[PDB]
Design a protein around this ligand. Sequence first.
Ligand SMILES: *[C@@H]1O[C@H](CO)[C@@H](O[C@@H]2O[C@H](CO)[C@@H](O[C@@H]3O[C@H](CO)[C@@H](O)[C@H](O)[C@@H]3O)[C@H](O)[C@H]2NC(C)=O)[C@H](O)[C@H]1NC(C)=O
Ligand SMILES: *[C@@H]1O[C@H](CO)[C@@H](O[C@@H]2O[C@H](CO)[C@@H](O[C@@H]3O[C@H](CO)[C@@H](O)[C@H](O)[C@@H]3O)[C@H](O)[C@H]2NC(C)=O)[C@H](O)[C@H]1NC(C)=O
Ligand SMILES: *[C@@H]1O[C@H](CO)[C@@H](O[C@@H]2O[C@H](CO)[C@@H](O[C@@H]3O[C@H](CO)[C@@H](O)[C@H](O)[C@@H]3O)[C@H](O)[C@H]2NC(C)=O)[C@H](O)[C@H]1NC(C)=O
Ligand SMILES: *[C@@H]1O[C@H](CO)[C@@H](O[C@@H]2O[C@H](CO)[C@@H](O[C@@H]3O[C@H](CO)[C@@H](O)[C@H](O)[C@@H]3O)[C@H](O)[C@H]2NC(C)=O)[C@H](O)[C@H]1NC(C)=O
Lengths: 48, 87, 48
Amino acid sequence: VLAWNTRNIDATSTGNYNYKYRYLRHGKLRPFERDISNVPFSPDGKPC
Amino acid sequence: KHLREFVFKNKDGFLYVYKGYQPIDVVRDLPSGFNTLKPIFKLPLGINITNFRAILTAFSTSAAAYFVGYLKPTTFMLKYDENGTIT
Amino acid sequence: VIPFKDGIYFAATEKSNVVRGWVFGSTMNNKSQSVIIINNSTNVVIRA
Ligand SMILES: *[C@@H]1O[C@H](CO)[C@@H](O[C@@H]2O[C@H](CO)[C@@H](O[C@@H]3O[C@H](CO)[C@@H](O)[C@H](O)[C@@H]3O)[C@H](O)[C@H]2NC(C)=O)[C@H](O)[C@H]1NC(C)=O
Ligand SMILES: *[C@@H]1O[C@H](CO)[C@@H](O[C@@H]2O[C@H](CO)[C@@H](O[C@@H]3O[C@H](CO)[C@@H](O)[C@H](O)[C@@H]3O)[C@H](O)[C@H]2NC(C)=O)[C@H](O)[C@H]1NC(C)=O
Ligand SMILES: *[C@@H]1O[C@H](CO)[C@@H](O[C@@H]2O[C@H](CO)[C@@H](O[C@@H]3O[C@H](CO)[C@@H](O)[C@H](O)[C@@H]3O)[C@H](O)[C@H]2NC(C)=O)[C@H](O)[C@H]1NC(C)=O
Ligand SMILES: *[C@@H]1O[C@H](CO)[C@@H](O[C@@H]2O[C@H](CO)[C@@H](O[C@@H]3O[C@H](CO)[C@@H](O)[C@H](O)[C@@H]3O)[C@H](O)[C@H]2NC(C)=O)[C@H](O)[C@H]1NC(C)=O
């Protein structure tokens, strides 16, 4: 696992908001899973 | 004339595929016997599989058939012959 | 549509090569990634 700082590359003075993360899902992901779906989330599985 | 066999498993982001076949003379049933399949693919797809569909051929018209079963975490003993073939 | 249930066995009896391939996925539509595996009689082609 390798990582480095990119403050002078990716970050911007106005805020670089071109990167996203997931925080809501009906259960956790499996190892090495690319869940890249993007629909409205509902706390009890309903359409919204 | 021929029976084709495949095994599909989705594990650690990889789709595993095994293949094998034999000559047949059956019309409607599923021939009994013993045959060991070999690995052919290991695809780093990283995708979520819960369903699948078969892709058929259109004619304009003989009959054809296929079969689906399900796999389980089951313990097996395998008998290897002198040449390393499972019999 | 047939459930995958974390692993399947598939077989087919042929005299005219009717079954050519399979599609594997979740919701089985363009709202998510899925893989198409086909024997197109000249090449075996796999795409996700
Ligand atoms: C692959 O994507 C499919 C998208 O449909 C996921 O299927 C859904 O998985 C959940 C979790 O097992 C299934 O059960 C649901 O659990 C929530 C938990 O609170 C519950 O509220 C729901 O009522 C339901 O029980 C859900 O039924 C299932 N949907 C379908 C159509 O089968 C699938 O889990 C994804 N695979 C992986 C490995 O994440
Ligand atoms: C696994 O090993 C056994 C060892 O006995 C193999 O059985 C024998 O394999 C040979 C080679 O095909 C068979 O044919 C023989 O070829 C020689 C070549 O000069 C010939 O002189 C003999 O008269 C005979 O034709 C032999 O019949 C066969 N023995 C028996 C009892 O079947 C076996 O084939 C090996 N398995 C594989 C998949 O190679
Ligand atoms: C997956 O592919 C299907 C193909 O049918 C997509 O469904 C179609 O989506 C369009 C919107 O992009 C729907 O509206 C259409 O808009 C055009 C714009 O000029 C209009 O000319 C059409 O008459 C229609 O209004 C279209 O009705 C819809 N088709 C169906 C059967 O629902 C679907 O959105 C695709 N999914 C993804 C994730 O791209
Ligand atoms: C069955 O699968 C084969 C293999 O993909 C298909 O034939 C292939 O078709 C492509 C384009 O139609 C042929 O040209 C290729 O284009 C790409 C574009 O970037 C290029 O990078 C390749 O170097 C090549 O130029 C390709 O040569 C051709 N291959 C063969 C063996 O025919 C075939 O069309 C498929 N059959 C059907 C009904 O789709």
